Structures are given as structure tokens and as C-alpha cells.
Design a protein around this ligand. Structure first.
Ligand SMILES: Nc1ncnc2c1ncn2[C@@H]1O[C@H](COP(=O)(O)OP(=O)(O)NP(=O)(O)O)[C@@H](O)[C@H]1Br
Ligand SMILES: Nc1ncnc2c1ncn2[C@@H]1O[C@H](COP(=O)(O)OP(=O)(O)NP(=O)(O)O)[C@@H](O)[C@H]1Br
Ligand SMILES: [Mg+2]
Ligand SMILES: [Mg+2]
Ligand SMILES: [Mg+2]
Ligand SMILES: [Mg+2]
Lengths: 874, 874
């Protein structure tokens, strides 16, 4: 009702939509009971009661036990049995169950309600040997699971007796032995904990309820919620349920199954069964499970009912189901059902098959494949993760999903060489740097000791869809000795290593792969998602190849080409950029810009060709000037530059010192450059249009857009747009061709949103840069936030990394403000977002709600953004 | 839409409140005509017509001239004369006039409308010599001022004639000679430019109107508007006005006066007069000026009327007036009036006297002293900045206003040594550090190559009122060689140098200072200001002495005590801070904190004592951690730290590297420290309350407030407040005394304003940190904005430095948002501001308008803030 919800024959107080309050288990237990399936009657204590228990100093809140007892009165009346009553005993199980899968909860306990009086009656009704062996096992399990007594003490007593009676197997103990062994188990309670074994079933129950509530706060449970940043959950529910017995004979048993294969998706029952056994009997390890076919032979009637129950449950839930069942002398009892966990390949197969079956429509099917299911299918995967558990030597952050296998190297230069030679390289560094970008691209996998889900390594890796395990604090990298260590284990250069960027696992040796499981059912499924979504999904790509990759993965255009990232390919390009940054005179700047123009024009041609017929938004330079400079001592930087620039050493020292900035993220960057050196903008715009026309002449449909970075005033935008229009006029005149184009702005400075109504009058489109916008809104340095982020997460100051999940109340308020103002000022304004949040499912759902026109994300995140964009609609 | 506004006998179309449209001159001409003063009738062409002329490619827009002629018809009818008519000639002057004083506009031209026919009649009617000398003068002035013909060519003709006719002085020429000479002046037009002298008055007029409009865009006018950051002004007005003749004889003349002494403020007419001369002769400064007594003797009636008119004008304008007047044959004409420019000493004297006289009320009096006047009374100024223009060698950011003159040194230690020896030191560094604070205090001026107007070093400088020029990228400092360079120029140690911290100018040599003026009336005037203002003025002070200086200057309390700035005084304090920053264990931190506690407690006692009876707001640590480390090589820093820390060298290296940050302004600072290391907040809060109780026990009234820095979520504030309350309870229990106190938060992060309604529930007060808030809102690094600020100002992107003048449309919107949300959530919330804008007059007006409770500023700005709070001039 309020905290206690009963369920029984043909009725129930809860339902499947109350997982939050009753947990998954309690919710479906009620659901199965309400649809008329044979479910042993019971009650569920809500998750709110768990929270009240924790908030009340780990003690049951007033009144709760009376509500619990009312529920028990229902269960007793329904079973025509009573707790302490040896003539008509009621036995109970106590089962944990939160809203979602949660490790560290209390294991389920069975046969709660046994004592000497009840067992004596049980002995008379069903045999002494069976009764006292059950009593013995209950003493062991209840003590361990509820009281915290290790099994080793109960086993010590069992072996002691066996030793002193010369008996070699458990099976050789007489009922008299077991009756005395019961007394020994009882003693274990006093010896281990000093409490007695509770002989009143109601005390056993109170202890079990407390233990389940306590389990919610177990160190294992807290760590799971902390790591995965699970925030909603109030607590765990407690399910108290009447017992049914699958260990009464060869017409009895217990089993589990998925209604379809959870690996392949094949529509065929997939499960186990144990004849003459309780649920607990395999966990005890004493029995080996058999296939379902055994049930069909030994219980044809119960098997028949099970099959039809599976059809019922699939029809009712419209999904593949994970069910637990027990048969007590030909009578089938349903004990659990839930949506069945499955692989990505299984999810897509099941969803598509269920559509073909007419069981679900495409709207529902889109909700049957999780984004994480899709992600499995987009990358290489290990053939059998469980097979390599033995070889795992560390676990870091899953920076970029996918499997990688190769040989260890400690240098980006060596990674390129090895890749050129056809070797597979796993690049291992403490941290990665701009100079490492070449090798990182060449490496099969990247492993770093520092850095979070937003490190340089992590984001560049995730851009390329390249496996990356980041922030692996366990490793110590030693360049000088060409090794890295984990404890006393040494891993040398050349050694084979495997990385799982999805789980963060670091594995020794050359593990077996499977390629991405591209297949027809995925294309058909994604086509449903594509027809469903309202948002368009553009791509963040800076190179022709990345643009092509982006289109192959479904991108409908380029929402962001970061021109600052278009000079990593070769030394000549790096040399030219360095000349431009080191320039002091306007002639030195003209020389450097004239060198850069062919590279910009050529790359833009390649991007335009890849995106034939789709819009391409190119952004003006927003460079990290200090990052374009060599790494090393000021003696090496000045010397290397002197070679690349030809300038005197003192001129380089002067310029380096003049370029240094205390806070470069807020410094002389973005449109502040384009405005201060309009020649820079002229060069880039000339490359854009010269390339646009050239490709137009080759039959390529060019739909160019030019975007200004880091705008905080309408005047900045107006200034750069003026330059753009001038250069467009010239090029069009020179080449005898005029192309339509658009000019727009980043909205990544809080001020831009605050006066968006002024900026909207002057822009064809907005694109939210939520990386900088989050940085400026919070005042978090995107390069240093790791210094306090973990504490802030631990202390409940933040729920997620705001650089990963979009901050709705703060940043999101600027996004709504800018969008509203912009569209009011310019009804034809287009609004997108190209920050990292654009690929993050919950943020995509937010962006859809705010009415944006598109999201833009790096190429291998496009499929995810697509499915995410479809799931918020349906 | 009207562009021509006439004025004449007892009527006028404009008025004094239309300066924006008619200019000051045209407005007051109309105003004087309207109050019935004898003003020569005329018309004013609006500043809009100037803008239209500039927007129509420097040509008169279509209907304007016909509108000008209609105005001329009015003038002609009013004077009963006509242009070109020798029987009843109308002669005109053309006078420029913008809304405010503006150099670079066209000089006034007189006697427009003369030719041979008109002059022949003028001769007959009013004397040949007067006519032809007027003609000759007009030919010269019109040719030079309107046609661009140098005076030297006209003078060459005059001298030639004198040479041939054997006469020595101009005045010795007969009317016949002048008649011959005008023909020569006519020839000058042809010889000089190939132009003819326009004989038609309407053409003369057309050219004069064009020239005035063109003069608005003169290089000198552009530069003045640019350097003074004058934005708004559409153009200049043109005044076409009937002539009166002060050169008809010895019963005629021209004069200027102030209605009171502009230097002393004495209520006595202060001016000059020239018998038999035109206003041109007053500009030229060739004739020796005669005293007003000369006018009284020679034109008694005109003098009597002038004295009457001066009282009229003072009553009408309620201020001291600067008037120009002409006497034509005993008849007085008023030709200009405006509020008279005056010194700071004069402004105060005039304001107080006018109150005593019953002419104005205290309300108006507080408007009669500009903040710049008060600044002239309180601080040194250079006597005439334009005179040293030739010696300026660089211009940096005006970090702290004021004039400094001293000898160059490159070391804070030498600066204090020199100050002890009685020398004046200009401290020149690349950057300043904590260890330099002593020398900075001892130096007359500070010049840095890096840093902005709001870099904490500059902030500390402005605290002392010490002239500081920052961000002077032109200079290269060389400590070893004991010089610094600007281009090829070398400036040695010991050389004399002058700094203008208001303009950022760096001047070679010893420049002259304006003598500070003592004012006996300043106390009563400031008292009126104090009664008038609504805002309270608190002080930003971090030491007991600074607190006392703030109180002496009128501070009503401490709005911000920056605890990070409370460890500069000695080496022992710096070491203690270094022990705390280098701490890795909680024990090392507890040690360091125990060492810091006595300094904090001692300082807080001194501050509480100085501010006896007034509120003192102490802010928790917000430190630049990198800045607290020794200067020098990483070999020296590690050794110095190793000695006093007693940590291993490798532990120091690792900690130094772990503390380094890419963007420290957005890094591990503010409440991010207090939350990560609550022991730090415990220590500070314990010092605060222990000091508060101690001083209370000595009879001091302590009104303590504790403020949390850099909050962006309600959780951050809640966290630190929880710590504060815990410590408060302990200390009050320990010492047996309970004090009332308040807890609050900085609003200096855009997110804090965006969710202020949540933060307001948990704060007793907000204080806007508009330094950081501007930094985060614009994305401008407070230390590096100087690299593009000048370009942005020059290109019209910014109107002001947003770190100096509050950005109302952006940052101001967050201020209003936060204030509104906070007060809705907590009706008793107090809201202040302690950013640098708190001392800036226009920003103080804005803060008044948004309904803040107080402004807080550094001690020497308190007086300007007080007056600014009284004036509230947007
Ligand atoms: N009242 C009962 N009568 C008979 N058999 C029972 C009864 N309650 C339970 N069981 C069995 O006990 C075993 C464990 O129960 P759970 O429901 O806890 O499932 P678990 O795998 O332990 N964790 P989870 O599924 O993730 O929630 C199952 O096989 C069920 Br059929
Ligand atoms: N119609 C007239 N009859 C006679 N004399 C006249 C007439 N119009 C003007 N003058 C005089 O000409 C001189 C210059 O005129 P301005 O208005 O230009 O004053 P300036 O100082 O040069 N610029 P300012 O700073 O705005 O005041 C003044 O001395 C006036 Br009285
Ligand atoms: Mg189960
Ligand atoms: Mg950006
Ligand atoms: Mg004048
Ligand atoms: Mg601050």
C-alpha cells in the first residue's frame, strides 16, 4: 500500500511500472501475479522504506513492522499456514532487489522459518533425514548471509563430525547424526558472534530485512553506484515470499531461461534445469545444471505450461524475458521475470525479428537496442572476454570503446614506424601530447597512466574510434628503460598486449578478436531510427578521410571542421604553421600564410568531395598557439624553431616570451586572432571558396558554411563576416563562378547567449560549443578540472562530469536563452551543437527538447547520436 | 524631421537640453535667446545633418540647403538685412560646436558675406578703414580656414605692401592701402590653389558648412574621441549667426569671463577684454588682454548689463558660467555661454558657496564636483600631459591611476633600500611576485611587462593608491645587465622615468607634477555626498593598517578581506604558506595550518579593532598556488623548499609538477580548496572567531561575516557553511562567548547567477566578484586580455575595457538575475559588490540602479566611490 505491497493469487498491489519503488523483482512479481500466473504469494517492502531505514540510523522506521506483519497475515491466510506453527508451517524466502542490477546486495535466503519444533513436525510429515538436513543447511546459509558467519565454521563442524564418526561422504550421515550436527551448527553462532540462533521465525525475518537494507550500503554496492555515477536510486526493496520446493522428488526441480538466445538472438528457449533441487543448490556448487530438455522429459505437463508462460510473458512485455521457475511435484511456479540482458548482436536480431513477427512496431523496436548495444557493434570486440580474465593485469578508464591488440611501444615515432612496417602497436605513455598525434593515429591502441574521460588522448582516440584505456594509475611508464610496470610485473617493449577500451581492461598477450558485426539487421534497424529522429546528425571532422568516415557512418554533413587541427599530417605543414606563429613582420606573416593556403585549399577540396551534396561548416582558426610549439627545454625549442624559422635565437626568445599566456583558454585565441590579423581570415576564406569552386567545376555539389569561433559580441561576428564577404566577392570574380554560402557563429561564450538577440540578426546559424561554454559557465578549466572533480563527485557537489553530460540547469539555460533569442531575431536561423555533448545520449535528448536543428559529433559517435536522436522521440 | 533650428530676439526653436542635436554652443545660444538676452540672431544645423552629410559621401543631403535658406530668411527678416545687398548687408559667422569639447574642428570664421559691392557700402555706412580691414581679414581667414590657404601667403602680401610703402606696422595702413591690399589677398587664392575667391555669399556659406562637417572627421578629432573612448556622438552642429562688430572703434570690443574664479572658486568676475577687436583676436592671443575694469571705464552701460547678465545666467543654469561677449558701440551682445571649466579646489569652493548663498541645494551641489575634481584634490597629477608627448617611449595598461616620478630599479629589495636612503624608485619588472610586495610598497611607481588591470598584483597596487602601468609588452627587462629596452632604446638603472597610471604612458625623464590643492570646504561637501548616497561604501582591505586607512577615508566596513593576501609581510609567513601548499600528508598540512593560525588570528584582531563597530567580511582562501613558490631555477626552488619543508627532493619535484596548471584562473582555487581540504577552512574560521571573541572581551564591537569564494553550485556553499558553523560552535563553547555572525558567498561564476535562487536559500549575503565574473562571461583572461584589447577598442568591438567599466548588457544581466533570484529566495539577503568596478563611477551608478546594498573598493578609492554613489550618473 504505502511501504508494503502484497502479491498473490490473481492480484497484486504493485505493477511492472513501479521498479523505482518495488525494484525490478518486486515489480514483476506483482505483474506476473496480476496477469494470473502461478506466483508464490508474498510482499515487497519499498525502496523508500530502505531510505527511511538508512536515514533513521539503520533502524526500522516506526510503524513499518506493523505494515510488514499485515502483509505476512495476508501470506499466512493465503497459504493457510503460520510461521512458528509446526502443524502448518509457513516458510519464507527473503530476496533483495533494487530498480536495476546492483552488485553487493544480500544473497537470497530460503527456508526462513525453521526451528526445532517446526523441523520435528517437518520430520514427521516428510522424513527425519530430509528435515534435519534442510535444518542444517538453513543454519549454515542464514548464519552466513544474514549474520555474517563464514561457511568455513559450519563446514569445520561437518568435517569434525565426519572425522569422529569415520564416515566418508555427507550422504552417509544418519538422521540422528544430522540432528546432533544441528546442535553443532547452533553453537557456531555463539562461538563466532556470541548471539544465539534466532528460533523465532519473526526474529529471523527482522534480521533478514535489516541485512538486505544494510546490504544496500555495502562497500561493493557503493563503489558500483560511484563508478557508474548512478544517482536516482533510493534503496533496495525486500521481497518476502512463501516457499515452494523443487527438492521433493523427481517430479520437482528448479530452472532458469531466456525466451530467446541472449548471444545470438535466435528465437529459441535458452536455459537450465535441475531435477530435485532448490534455487540455492548450484550456488552451493553441490549440483550441476542440465538443459531444459531434461524438464520436458521428466515434466511434460509443467514444461508445456512453461512454454506457454513464456509466450504470455513475451506478449505482455513485448520483449525477450529472463525468467526463474520452480516445479513442486508437477506444479509449476513462476518466481522471477525481467527483461533479459543480451548482447548487441542479440538486441538487434531480437528487435528486428519481433518486428517481422508483428509482435512490436518499429517505434518500440528502436527502444529495444540500447546505445551501448549499438556501440558494441561499431567496434572490434574480443571473441570471449571471460576467457582472458586470468590475464588481466590492470583496469583503467574506458576512454574509447573497442578492442585493440598489438605490441607495446613507448613513442609516437616508433608507433608510426611500426605501423609503416605493418606491425600492430599499442602506444603506452604517462600522458599524450600534440606531437604524439601522428603515432596515436598509427597505433592500434593507446594506454595512458594519467587523464580522464576528457583527456587529450581520450578525446582524440574517441574521435578516430580508436581503442583507448586512460587514467590507468596502476601502471608506471619508463621511457628510458623502455618498459612499464604494474606492481612488480614488468612489461617490455615489443610484448604483446590487449586493451578493452569499453571495460578499461589491460590484458597480457595477444587476445582473439571478432571484427565489427556489420550485417543486414543493423542497417534495417538504423533505417528505422533514421526515419524516427527529428534532429539531424552532422559530423565533427577536420580531414578528407575523417569526413568520408563520417559519411560512411551516417553523417548528414560536417557541423564542425576545426581548421586548427588541419596541420598535423606532415612536417612541412607544422613548419608553415610555426612560421605563421613566430611571425613578427606582416611580410613574414604573408610568407607563412602563402605557404598554408595550398594545404587548406587541398584539404577543403577533399572534404567537399567526401561530403558531395551535404552541408559542410568550416570554422576559422582557433589555435592553441603554445601547443604548436615544440616540446622540451627552452634550449631545444629555440634551436628547433631557429631551424624552422631561420630567425635569430634572441628573436625567438623574445617572441616565445611574448606569446606565453597565464590562461591560454581565455587568451589570444578564436576570433581574437582573425580580427587582429585579418590576413589570416582572408587566407582561410580564400582556400574555402577556391576549393568550393574547384570541386563545383568537377561536378561536386558544395554547400559551404563558414563559422566564427569564440564570439562574445555582435561586433566580432560582424567584423569577420565583413572579411568573409570581401574575399568571396574576389574569388567568385577571379574564377567566374558564384556559389551560395552561409555565415554563422559559435555560441560558446556566456555573453553570446546573453545578447543572442543581437547576434542572431547577423548570423545564418548558431552552433553551441558546449566545451568552452561549460568551461566558462562553471569556471572549470577543461585541462585541470581533474584536480577536484573526483572530490566533487564523491561529496555530491556534482552528479556527473559537466564536460560529459550537459548541465541543464546552468549551461542548458544559456542554450535555451540563445536559441529563443536567436530564432526570434532571425526566424530562418539554424541552431546546432558541436561540443562533445552532441554525441552523448542524455544530452542529445536535451538538445532535442530545446528544439535544436542538429547535433554534430565525431565520426564514430554519429551512429550513437542517430539512435539517441530517435529514442527521445518514440 | 527638422535639421535647422533658428534663434533670435526673444524666441528660439532649440534649448539648452538639446546639446546632442544642436551642440553645446547651439543649445546655449538658443537658451540665452529664449531667456531674453541680446544674442545676435542665427540658426543651427543639427548634428544629424552632419551624420547625413558624412553618410552621403561628404555632400549636403537633398532638402537641407533649402531648409538652411529658410533659416537664413528668418535671420534676414530679423536683422532687416539681406545677403549680398550693399544697402542693407547681412554678414555672418560660421561656428562649429559638438555636444562636448572637441579638438580638431574648424575654427570660427567671421564677416562671411563680404565682397567689393557689399564692402563699398559697408565703408560708406560704417567707415572705410573698418570695412576694408574687415574685408582683408575675412579674405585671409576664409581662405585659410575654409580653403586651406596658409596664412603665410596673405602675410607675405601684407609685408610686401608695407615694405613698398615704407610703413612698419599693420595699423599704419590707410583705408586706401587696405583697398589696394584686398586685391592682393584675392590674388593669393589664384596663386595658392588656382581657386577664385567666391564673391557670392551663398557659395561662401556652402563651403563653410561643408568644411565644418569635414572637420568633424579630422585626424585630431578622431584621435581625441578614440583615446578618451567617446562613443555615441553623431557629429558636429554648424551655427550660422549674424555679425556684431567689436572693432568699429574704441566704444566697441570683445571679452570673455568666468562668473567666478575658476582656480580659486572666489565669487568675483574673472575675465579679459579687448577694446576695438574681434573675437578672432582673442583666439590668436596676439593682443594684450585688458582687464574688465577697462570695459567698465570705456563702456559703462555695457558693463552694467554684463554684470546683470552674469547673475541671470548663474541663476538660470545654477552654476558658474563661461561667457563670451561683444560690445558694438556701447551695445552689449552675448555670443556664448556654457558651464565653466574649473579646478577641483574651485569646484568645491563654488559648490559650497552656492549652497550658502541659497542658489542651489545640497542635491545639486554634489553634481557640481566631478569625480575628476575630487581626484585632483586627493592625488598627484602631471601638470600638462600633452607637453611631454615628445618623451613618451611606450604605453601600457593603466593598472592603477596616478602620476609617479622616480629612478629605475629592477629589484624589490633595492626599491626598499632606495626608499630608505630617501631616493624615489620606479620598480621595473617582467612580473611581480609575493616576495616583491615590500619593494612595491616602497616604490613611487611600478612598471610591468605582463599582467592586466585586474591582475592581483595590480589590485594590491591600487590598494595603496600607487601608480602602476602594467602589461607593457614593448619593454624587455634584463636583470643581469640592469637595464630594460624599448626597441633600440636602452634605459639604465638609476635613470629618471615618469609613469602615468591613468593613461598607461611611460615617459623618459623627470616630468612636472601638478601641486596638490588643500581644500577647507571638502569635508562639508563630502558630508553632503554622504547624506545623499543610498549605497554604503565598504572597503577591500587585507591588513589592519589598510583597514584603518579605509576607515579614515570613509569606509563603513570591510566588504572583502582577501585572506590570500595576508602572508606578504614577512618570510616566516611565506614559509608557513609554502609548508601548507607543499603538504602531501594530512599531518604536514596540520603542522602548516597550526603555524598559520596565529598570523591569521592576530591579523583579524587588528582588522576587527580598526573597524570597531562596523561589519567586516572575511573571505576564505582563494590562492594562486603557483605564485606562492620561490622564484628562480627548478634546482633552486626545490632546494629552498627542501630546507624549510623537510620533504625529499623527489617529493618536492612531484608536488610542484602536480600543482602546475594550464589555466590557473579556472583551476584548483577558491572553494575548490576549502572543500578538498576542510582543515584549511577550519583553521581560518577558528582564527576568525577566536580573534572576534578576544576583541569582544576587550570592548571592541565585532560584526563578523564569512564569505565563500568562487561558488558555482549551492552544494559548494552548503559544504563550507557547514564547516563554518561547526567551528563557530566549538570556539564559542571553548571561550564561553557567543557572537552573532553571518555567512555568505561570492557571486563571481556565471552559473551562480543562473541558479541564484538555490544559492540564495543558503546565504545571508551575496557579493558580486565582477573581476572573475567579467573574465568568465567574456572569456577574457584577466592577465592576458591586453594582447587584443587595444585592437578591439580601436575597431569598435568594445567601447570600454569590460574589466574597468561594467558591461551592463552582459555581466550586468547576470547581476540583475542573481540579485532578483536571491532576494526572492531570501527576503533578508544582503547584496554587495567587491570587484574593481565597485570604485568606478559609472559602474557605481549601475549598482545603485540595480538596488545593491553597498559597493566595496580599495581604501584610496573609497572617497571617489562615495561621491559616485551620491551622483549616480549612468
Ligand atoms: N519463495 C521461493 N520459493 C522457491 N524458490 C525460491 C523462492 N525465492 C527464491 N527462490 C529461488 O532462489 C534463487 C535465488 O533467488 P533470486 O530471486 O534472489 O535470484 P538471484 O539470482 O539470487 N539474484 P537476482 O535474480 O539478480 O535478483 C532462484 O533460483 C529462485 Br527460483
Ligand atoms: N556673429 C558673431 N559676431 C561677432 N563675433 C562673433 C560671432 N560669432 C562668433 N564670434 C566671436 O568669434 C570668436 C570665435 O568664435 P567661437 O564660437 O568659435 O569660439 P572658439 O573659442 O574659437 N571655439 P569654442 O571653444 O566653441 O568657443 C569668439 O571670440 C566669438 Br565672441
Ligand atoms: Mg534470480
Ligand atoms: Mg571552441
Ligand atoms: Mg569660445
Ligand atoms: Mg574572485
Amino acid at each position: 500500500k504505502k511501504r508494503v505491497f502484497t502479491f498473490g493469487k490473481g492480484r497484486s498491489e504493485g505493477n511492472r511500472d513501479m521498479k523505482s519503488l518495488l525494484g525490478g523483482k518486486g515489480a514483476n512479481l506483482a505483474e506476473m501475479s496480476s496477469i494470473g500466473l502461478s506466483v508464490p504469494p508474498g510482499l515487497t517492502i519499498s525502496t523508500e522504506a530502505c531510505e527511511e531505514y538508512q536515514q533513521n540510523g539503520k533502524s526500522l522506521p516506526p510503524g513499518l513492522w506493523d505494515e510488514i506483519s499485515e502483509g505476512l497475515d495476508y501470506v499466512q491466510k493465503e497459504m493457510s499456514a503460520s510461521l512458528g506453527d509446526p502443524s502448518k508451517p509457513l516458510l519464507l524466502s527473503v530476496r533483495s532487489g533494487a530498480a536495476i542490477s546492483m552488485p553487493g546486495m544480500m544473497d537470497t535466503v530460503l527456508n526462513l522459518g525453521l526451528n526445532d519444533e517446526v523441523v520435528a513436525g517437518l520430520a514427521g510429515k516428510s522424513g527425519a533425514r530430509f528435515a534435519y538436513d534442510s535444518y542444517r543447511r538453513f543454519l549454515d546459509m542464514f548464519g552466513n548471509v544474514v549474520m555474517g558467519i563464514p561457511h568455513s565454521l559450519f563446514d569445520e563442524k561437518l568435517e569434525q563430525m565426519k572425522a569422529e564418526k569415520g564416515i566418508h561422504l555427507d550422504t552417509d550421515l544418519t538422521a540422528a547424526d544430522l540432528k546432533d550436527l544441528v546442535e553443532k551448527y547452533k553453537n557456531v553462532y555463539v562461538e563466532a558472534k556470541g548471539e544465539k540462533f534466532p528460533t523465532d521465525p519473526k526474529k529471523q525475518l527482522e534480521l533478514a530485512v535489516n541485512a538486505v537494507f544494510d546490504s544496500w550500503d555495502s562497500p561493493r554496492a557503493n563503489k558500483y553506484r560511484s563508478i557508474n555515477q548512478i544517482t536516482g536510486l533510493k534503496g533496495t526493496a525486500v521481497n518476502i515470499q512463501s516457499m515452494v520446493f523443487g527438492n521433493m522428488g523427481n517430479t520437482s526441480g528448479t530452472g532458469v531461461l531466456f525466451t530467446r538466445n541472449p548471444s545470438t538472438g535466435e528465437k529459441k528457449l535458452y536455459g537450465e534445469f535441475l531435477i530435485n533441487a532448490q534455487g540455492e543448490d548450484v550456488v552451493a556448487g553441490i549440483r550441476t545444471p542440465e538443459d531444459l530438455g531434461t524438464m520436458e522429459t521428466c515434466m511434460p505437463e509443467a514444461y508445456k505450461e512453461l512454454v506457454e508462460n513464456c509466450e504470455i510473458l513475451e506478449r505482455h512485455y513485448k520483449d525477450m524475458m529472463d525468467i526463474e521457475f520452480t516445479v513442486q511435484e508437477n506444479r509449476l511456479w513462476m518466481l522471477q521475470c525481467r527483461t533479459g540482458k543480451r548482447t548487441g548482436k542479440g538486441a538487434v536480431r531480437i528487435a528486428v525479428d519481433m518486428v517481422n513477427e508483428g509482435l512490436i512496431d518499429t517505434r518500440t523496436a528502436i527502444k529495444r537496442v540500447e546505445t551501448q548495444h549499438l556501440d558494441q557493434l561499431l567496434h572490434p570486440q574480443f571473441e570471449d572476454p571471460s576467457a582472458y580474465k586470468s590475464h588481466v593485469v590492470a583496469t583503467g578508464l574506458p576512454a574509447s570503446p573497442g578492442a585493440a591488440v598489438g605490441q607495446v611501444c613507448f613513442s609516437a615515432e616508433d608507433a608510426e614506424t611500426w605501423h609503416a612496417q605493418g606491425k600492430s602497436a599499442i602506444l603506452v605513455r604517462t600522458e599524450t601530447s600534440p606531437e604524439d598525434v601522428g603515432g596515436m593515429h598509427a597505433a592500434a591502441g593507446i594506454l595512458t597512466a594519467r587523464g580522464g574521460m576528457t583527456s587529450h588522448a581520450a578525446v582524440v582516440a574517441r574521435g578516430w574510434g580508436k581503442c583507448c584505456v586512460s587514467g590507468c594509475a596502476d601502471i608506471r611508464v619508463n621511457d628510458d628503460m623502455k618498459i612499464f610496470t604494474i606492481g612488480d610485473r614488468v612489461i617490455k617493449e615489443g610484448d604483446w598486449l590487449s586493451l578493452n577500451g569499453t571495460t578499461g581492461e589491460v590484458i597480457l598477450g595477444k587476445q582473439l578478436l571478432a571484427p565489427p558485426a556489420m550485417s543486414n539487421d543493423l542497417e534495417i534497424f538504423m533505417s528505422w531510427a533514421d526515419q524516427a529522429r527529428r534532429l539531424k546528425v552532422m559530423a565533427n571532422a577536420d580531414t578528407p578521410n575523417d569526413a568520408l568516415t563520417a559519411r560512411n557512418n551516417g553523417a548528414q554533413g560536417i557541423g564542425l571542421c576545426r581548421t586548427e587541427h588541419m596541420f598535423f599530417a606532415s612536417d612541412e605543414r607544422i613548419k608553415a604553421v610555426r612560421k605563421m606563429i613566430m611571425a613578427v613582420t606582416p611580410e613574414q606573416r604573408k610568407v607563412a600564410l602563402d605557404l598554408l593556403l595550398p594545404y587548406q585549399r587541398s584539404d577543403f577540396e577533399g572534404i567537399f568531395r567526401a561530403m558531395d551534396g551535404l552541408p559542410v561548416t568550416i570554422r576559422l582558426l582557433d589555435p592553441p598557439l603554445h601547443e604548436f610549439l615544440p616540446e622540451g627545454d627552452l634550449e631545444h625549442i629555440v634551436n628547433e624553431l631557429a631551424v624552422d624559422t631561420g630567425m635569430s635565437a634572441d628573436e625567438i626568445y623574445s617572441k616565445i616570451e611574448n606569446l606565453s599566456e597565464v590562461n591560454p583558454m581565455l587568451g589570444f585565441r578564436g576570433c581574437r586572432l582573425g580580427i587582429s590579423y585579418p590576413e589570416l581570415t582572408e587566407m582561410q576564406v580564400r582556400a574555402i571558396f577556391q576549393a568550393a569552386v574547384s570541386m563545383t567545376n568537377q561536378g561536386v555539389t558544395v554547400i559551404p558554411e563558414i563559422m566564427v569561433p569564440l564570439v562574445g559580441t555582435p561586433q566580432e561576428l560582424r567584423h569577420q563576416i565583413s572579411v568573409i564577404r570581401g574575399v568571396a566577392a574576389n574569388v567568385f570574380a577571379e574564377m567566374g563562378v558564384t556559389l551560395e554560402y552561409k555565415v554563422g557563429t559559435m555560441i560558446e561564450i556566456p555573453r553570446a547567449a546573453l545578447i543572442a538577440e543581437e547576434i542572431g540578426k547577423e548570423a545564418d546559424f548558431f552552433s553551441f560549443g558546449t566545451n568552452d561554454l561549460t568551461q566558462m559557465t562553471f569556471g572549470y578549466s577543461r585541462d585541470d578540472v581533474g584536480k577536484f572533480l573526483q572530490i566533487y563527485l564523491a561529496q555530491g557537489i556534482l552528479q556527473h562530469d559537466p564536460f560529459e553530460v550537459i548541465d541543464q540547469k546552468g549551461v542548458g539555460q544559456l542554450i535555451k536563452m540563445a536559441t529563443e533569442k536567436g530564432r526570434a531575431a532571425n526566424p530562418s536561423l539554424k541552431v546546432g551543437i558541436c561540443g562533445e555533448h552532441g554525441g552523448e545520449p542524455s544530452s542529445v535528448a536535451f538538445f532535442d527538447g530545446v528544439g535544436l536543428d542538429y547535433v554534430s559529433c565525431s565520426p564514430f559517435r554519429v551512429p550513437i547520436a542517430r539512435l539517441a536522436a530517435a529514442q527521445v522521440i518514440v
